[PDB]
Every structure is written in C-alpha cells, then in structure tokens.
Design a protein around this ligand. Sequence first.
Ligand code: HEM
Ligand code: HEM
Ligand SMILES: O=C(CCCCCn1ccnc1)N[C@@H](Cc1ccccc1)C(=O)O
Ligand SMILES: O=C(CCCCCn1ccnc1)N[C@@H](Cc1ccccc1)C(=O)O
Lengths: 445, 447
Amino acid sequence: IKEMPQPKTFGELKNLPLLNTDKPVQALMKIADELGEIFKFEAPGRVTRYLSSQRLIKEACDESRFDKNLSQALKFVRDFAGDGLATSWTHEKNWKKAHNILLPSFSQQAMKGYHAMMVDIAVQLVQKWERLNADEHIEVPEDMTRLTLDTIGLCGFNYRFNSFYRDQPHPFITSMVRALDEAMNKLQRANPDDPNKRQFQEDIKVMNDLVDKIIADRQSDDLLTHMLNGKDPETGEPLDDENIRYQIITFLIAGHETTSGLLSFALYFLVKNPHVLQKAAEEAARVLVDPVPSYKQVKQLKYVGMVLNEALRLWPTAPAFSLYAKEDTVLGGEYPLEKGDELMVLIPQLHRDKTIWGDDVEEFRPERFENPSAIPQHAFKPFGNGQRACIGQQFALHEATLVLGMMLKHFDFEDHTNYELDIKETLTLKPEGFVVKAKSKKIPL
Amino acid sequence: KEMPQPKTFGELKNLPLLNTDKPVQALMKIADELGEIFKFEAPGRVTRYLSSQRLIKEACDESRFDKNLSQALKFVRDFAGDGLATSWTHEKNWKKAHNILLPSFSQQAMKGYHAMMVDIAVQLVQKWERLNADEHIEVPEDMTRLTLDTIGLCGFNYRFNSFYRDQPHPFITSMVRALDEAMNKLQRANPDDPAYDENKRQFQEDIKVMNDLVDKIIADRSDDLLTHMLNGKDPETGEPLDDENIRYQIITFLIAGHETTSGLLSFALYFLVKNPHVLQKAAEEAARVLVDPVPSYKQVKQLKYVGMVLNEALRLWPTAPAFSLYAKEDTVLGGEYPLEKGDELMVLIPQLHRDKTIWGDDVEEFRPERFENPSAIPQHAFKPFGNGQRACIGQQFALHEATLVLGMMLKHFDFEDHTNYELDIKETLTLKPEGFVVKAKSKKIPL
Ligand code: HEM
Ligand code: HEM
Ligand SMILES: O=C(CCCCCn1ccnc1)N[C@@H](Cc1ccccc1)C(=O)O
Ligand SMILES: O=C(CCCCCn1ccnc1)N[C@@H](Cc1ccccc1)C(=O)O
C-alpha cells in the first residue's frame, strides 16, 4: 500500500479550518502543489481524497468503479434544487427520467432552434458597448452574467430577465450569493443550532416566486416545453410538477453562472495575450460576414473554440466534482478504497498536470487544442464525466463562441488598467473586478 | 474572377508540364508566375493549385472541403489499398483504423518507442564515429537507413538492419521504379497499348516483393503498432481490423513512416551547414541538454531550438509537398472563384510556406526563430502535416525521432560542407536533397 499525504490540522477540527477562506479552490490547488497527486482531507464526520493527476483521475472516471457523489456543496444546493438533474443521485428515479426527457433539448436540432434567441441577447450586449461614451469602461463579469442569464431565460423558458435594462443584479442573483455565504459560514460552526436561518428560507422563496411566474405564463418548443410535455421512453411518464420546479431552478443557475465565468476568463486571456487576440479577431472578421451570425457560421469559429477550451483548461469555472466507490477497489495500484469512500476531482490541478501538457502549463496557448485527437482521455474534464457530465456543454459552448465571436468582430479591446487577476469564488470561479475598454470597429448590425 | 492557367499543348492541355523529373518545382515556378491560384487541366481531369494562405485557410475548412485522392494517391492505393493514407474519409476502414491506431501515437506509446529510436540512433552515431579520415557521409542515404530501421523496429519489432548494407533493400528500389512507371503512365494516351505489357509485368513483381516483406513481418509476429493492428478494437463499432486491411496498414506505415522523415533530417542538416550561426546555436542547445550518454525522452522534449530548426526546414521544403481536397458542396472560394460540388483543389505546400504576406520579405532565409511562438503564426499558414482529421497521424513520431537524432548528431560531431554542395532536390512523391554529402569530425564524446 502507499500512505496518503494530508495537509496541516487544527486539533479536533482536523482540516476543516483550511476551507475558512474566500478562495478555497485556490487554497486546495496550493495544497495539491505541495502534496502531489492525492491527499486526504478530513473534517468532523467526513473524509475525502483530492485527486490532481490524470493517472488517478482516469481511474476515478471509470463508471463501473465510481459513481457521482453529492459533495457538501451540492447537498447545500439540493436544499433548493431538490432532485433536479445536477443534485440528484444517479440511482434516484427522477435522475434518469429527467435525463431521458431533457437530453433531446440539447440536440443539434435544438441548438439550431435556440440560435436566434442567443443572437437576440448577444446583439443587446454589442449594442450596450457600442453606446458607451469615450473613456467609459466595461465591467466584464457583470456584463457576461447579464448575457448568460438572459440567454438561459429566453432560450429555455421564453422569459426575459431584461438584464441590460438594469444597473444592479436581479433579486434572484443577490439572494443566492447571501445563501451561499451563509451556507459556507455554517460549515465552520461547531453548534449551528445554537439560537440567519430565516434569510435562507426567504432566499428559497424569492426563487420560487420567479418559478411560478415562468410556469403560469407558459406556441413554443423550448426547454420548458419539453419539461411540461415530454415523456420518458423508459417509464412512459412525464415529469411531475414538483420535479419540474426543481429543474427550472437547476437550469436557471447551472445554465448561466459557469458560462459567464468562461466568457470572462476568455476575454481576460485574450487581452493578456495580444498574439492570440489578433488570431481570434482575424477569424471572427473572416467568418462572421453577415450582420448577425448564422448557426453554421458559429460552427466555423474553430480558433475561438480553441480559445474557449484553453480558458477552461486554466480556469475551469466548475472547479470540482465528487465521486464515491461503488465497491471495494484499489486506486492507482497503491490506494485501497472501501465501498462508499469519496473522491474529489480538482479540475484546475488536473489541467496543470505537466506529464500530460508539458512544462509550460501556466501559459495560455489555444494551439494546444488545434487537433482534438492529441489530448488523452480524461486529461481535460471541465464538463465532468460520463453519464453525469454536463448536459448543457453544447449550449454553453455555442453561446460562448457566438458571443465571443461577435465581441471580437465589433470591438478592439484594451487592458487599460493592467488588470491583476483576482479570482472570486462562489461555487464557481470568475475574475473579480476585470474591466476593459472597447473601441468600436464601426461595423453595423 | 477568371482563373489563370499555364501554357497548353492542344488536346493534351497542361499534362506535358508534368513530364519532368521535378514536377513540384515546376509547379512552384508556375505559381511564381501566375499567383495564388491557377487552373491545371489534363485529359479527363481539372484541378486548381492553391498557393496563398488567404485561399488555403478556406480550403482547410472541413465543413466545406474533404480530403481527395490525387492521382498520386490513387497510384499508391493500388498497393496500399484502404490503408489510412489512401482511404476516403467516408470508407468504413478509415475511421475504424483511425480509432484503432491513434493510441499507437499517444505519449505513453511514444515513451515506449523512445528506447528503440535510441537503438537505431546509436547505430547511426557509431557508423559515423567509425569512418576513417577524409571519408564522407552520404546524408539522405544514411537518414533513410535510420528512419526505415526506426519504423521497422518501433512499428513492427522487425530489424531491417540497414546499417549492415551498402545498398538499399530490394523493396525500396522496387518502390521507386513502380512510381517511375506510374509517372510515365500519366503521359500515355493509350496505356492499354500492347507496347506496355512489359511495363505492367514489372509493376506486379514490385507489389509482390513488398507483399513478400509484409508476409515476413506477419510471420515473425510487444505493445507496438502491429500489436494494435492485430488486437485493437474500434470503440465505435467494437470491431478489430480484418487481415486484408492490416496488410494495407503495414504497407502504408512502412512507407509513410520513414520517407518524409528521412527527407526532413536531410534538409535540416543541409540548412544547418549552410547557416553556420544557426548550426552553432543548435549545437549549443544539444550540448547543454544532452548531458547523458543517451538522450532521455524528457531531454528530447527540451530540445526546443532543434525542434524549431526542424519546423523551419519543413517550411522551406515540406517533404510531403502537396495534398488534395474536393468541395463537399457548391461553394465560392475567396469571394471570387465559384466551385461546384466535387471540384478538386491542390494545396502547393512549398509555395504556401513562401507567402510573403505571412512570413515577411525574407521568406527564402533559414530562420528557426520564426517558430518561437505558435500563437504568433497565422492560422493555416504552416501545413507540412496536412489538415484536420486527415492530418498526419505520425507527426509526433516523426518529430520526436528527428529531434532525437539531430540532437545526437549535433552533440557528437562538427560538420563540414566540404564540397560546397549545390542543392539538387530529387522528387519521388516526396522531396530530398540528392547527392548531399558532408564530412563529420567527431567531438569524441562516448556513448
Ligand atoms: C462553461 C460552462 C459550463 C461548465 C464549465 C459546466 C460544468 C459542469 C460540470 C463539471 C458538471 C458535472 C458536475 C458534477 O459532476 O457534480 C455539470 C453538470 C451539469 N450542468 Fe453544466 N457546465 C456549464 C454549462 C452549463 C449549461 C449552459 C447548462 C444548462 C443549459 C448546464 C447544466 C448542467 C446540468 C443540468 C448538469 C447536471 C447533469 C446531470 O448530472 O444529469 N451547465 N456542468
Ligand atoms: C516529417 C515527416 C512527415 C511528413 C512531412 C508527413 C506529411 C504528411 C501529410 C502532408 C499527410 C496528409 C496527406 C494528405 O492529406 O493526403 C500525412 C498523412 C499521413 N501520414 Fe505522414 N508525414 C510525416 C511522417 C509520418 C510518419 C512518421 C508516419 C507513421 C509513423 C506517417 C504516417 C501517415 C499516415 C498514416 C497518414 C494518413 C493519415 C490519415 O489520413 O488518417 N507520416 N503525412
Ligand atoms: O471542494 C469543493 C468544491 C466543489 C463545488 C462545484 C459545484 N458545481 C458543479 C457544477 N457547477 C457547479 N467542495 C467540498 C468542500 C468540503 C470538503 C470536505 C469537507 C467539507 C467540505 C465539498 O463540498 O464537499
Ligand atoms: O501534385 C501532385 C503531387 C502530390 C503528391 C503527394 C504525395 N504524398 C502525400 C503524402 N505523402 C506523400 N500530384 C498531382 C499531379 C497531377 C495533376 C493534374 C493531373 C494529373 C496529375 C496528382 O497526383 O493528382
């Protein structure tokens, strides 16, 4: 066997105070840098093991040996997302049922149907930036969140959040950050039930109000249509009212936060790497020859897609997923695991494995993705694994390629503050305070 | 726009322009005169030769264009069948063999090949260490010895033992005379004339001799290329390759796995001895990195400047000089040249690599520093390994072998261009510098 490294401990609290930080993922990456491809992490009543090497993670992604686990973060999310797709166990009846019902909503016939509504929101973004005065700047993650929230609202539910008509974020968004802030605070409390609880219940209510409005309002053929009318071929059943509500909550959050982070990181890397920005902008100008992009044109933005994958390599905006051992098994030939033992896949560290990518892992080089065939299996996992992989991957990448393509077509960008990367962590990653200036190329829509 | 076209010969159209020993260089001269695109007609065929990055970047759009079998590849297909290089993308055996063989070029596999590449590379170094004073090196001959032995050993655990022979193996000589016959046949108006019965008989003998080698390799039969051919299963269909296609893959990899790589090493050494400042910089890297008696896999990955030398040699003289494409549907090229579904294109790689709007005015100068940063190179400007899903499956194999061998050469010898060699590019289906010779003075560093 092989004894597993473990970071510094705090008495009876074990490793738990290491998570008492604003940037826990980045703290865990630093621990992985020090301890290597695997380390144990203990809290009162919990043990897990953080994996960082492709060698171990490829075994963890073997679905015959490991299944998706609900991390403590996902168990928190489950308090309001229920048995929606992202917070259900694979063995719960409603996972496979909703999976079968909703997977056609992300087929290529479906993406072609969403395209016009994605363009609707993208044009609003371009128009906002065209209308800024001289020396005004862009708050990048803020505007990317406006775009991605509006896109999932419109494409999925025919609901307009109208985020570009607001200077502050919507009630939904603000409350959910406070609930998450509270959730993380309660983790470090020895006696949580000591006479805070009320606000979380209030936050669960704001989201239910938007969900009822979306349902009552609903001829359309979008995500909500399939939720309300689709039947699972296996059970022959449609989703029930309770699970539909959970899916709406699930897709409103999962359908925009990570995609906003991706667009924000991609633009960050472009302005920090002018050779790459020039190459991406040349593609956008050459391919996007019409006032609004067509579906087929977006599919031709190969280098823009490479930029997005390389941004996901360095800063995968959903930074981890969790697994449990289905039976007793031995990991890597050296770490015996018992049935039910948990693993965490630390995606940013996997993506920095020098034995896979070479020694220059910290450099932003979209050309790594010029030939998809050259990447080993399970080396690149920003969308999770297997049957529990991200159902919205094609949606996110089509939206982000379209929008980044239009951004590069219509503006020159300046890193006017020489922005120093500052990664704020919710359950996802984004570059806090990232601002740029955009000079219009004066190309009409 | 009306497409330029070179001079014609009546009903023979442009075909007599290819009746030359150096057709690629003839086509480059035509491209120099006519520009980024020209029509080329023969009896029963029309194609268009592209030379600018502006047009070739569109041709590399896989939604609009797919790999075409040129007449040269149709010739190779007479004995390479539906192997990887001569199959159409839509033939079942292309994707099937692609999925089965791609793991044979993963980095776990390359680490497995490294020791066998070192085996052959040491034989090269020892041959040159053992030359007497004032003896010289026949460069393309020894590079072909090395690359043939390397693909034989790494791919099939078969030793050609080329360093034990003063003349090439029979199949190599067999290969070229078959090609010579094929290229003569282009010019024949009546190929089924009885006057060419003798020519056909010899072609079949050649296909037999190469096939005799394949039988020997299979009869002999590790975790190598042939292992995957015989045991791998395509994840999509769940099927292994059948015996007939395996034979075609062996033929394919025996040829594709060594000829272009020998040309690359030969051109790289040519450019180094013609550019002493570059040679000194590469030799300094080799001395700094290769600190052990034999290079490690990791050390080869660290020969950064040597890798740039190889890419710059591929820029000026890409040893696979062209590839062919066809339009998947009606489309317009460059906004001005309308194409119909099925219309064919030829990508003239040496001319693409001389596009002054991409590389600057010094395109003919050998400057490996052009390749310091791949992000600084425009998209589709550099295509020595083809394009897209039909790009060279052996690219990393070729570059690892050539970097290892060139690194060891630079570590162990000083080189002299003692004849002031005048570049003379011999054309098969690939390019190589004929008659290139050097003298090597050992630095007396043991292995
Ligand atoms: C760049 C953007 C995105 C990233 C990086 C991302 C990442 C991920 C990851 C890593 C998982 C697996 C999590 C786990 O195993 O616990 C996942 C699952 C999921 N994602 Fe995404 N996602 C993105 C965009 C989207 C979009 C646009 C949607 C909806 C339109 C979406 C909806 C979902 C859902 C429903 C699941 C759960 C799937 C299931 O278990 O059946 N995501 N995502
Ligand atoms: C410097 C050395 C090399 C060069 C310049 C080169 C060049 C090329 C080019 C341009 C193509 C595409 C041809 C077309 O589109 O018709 C190609 C394909 C191919 N090459 Fe290479 N090659 C080299 C080394 C190798 C090696 C070492 C191997 C085998 C170990 C190999 C095997 C193949 C195969 C099998 C294909 C067909 C791939 C497919 O269509 O699936 N080549 N090569
Ligand atoms: O590491 C992480 C971050 C994972 C969140 C990703 C969420 N996502 C998925 C798709 N889109 C977002 N989380 C651990 C922390 C912990 C470890 C031990 C003990 C207590 C807490 C956990 O939640 O269990
Ligand atoms: O230009 C070429 C040379 C291409 C050879 C590439 C061979 N290779 C590929 C991978 N490794 C080697 N070939 C044309 C010539 C022709 C044009 C018009 C009419 C008749 C013949 C053709 O073969 O079609």
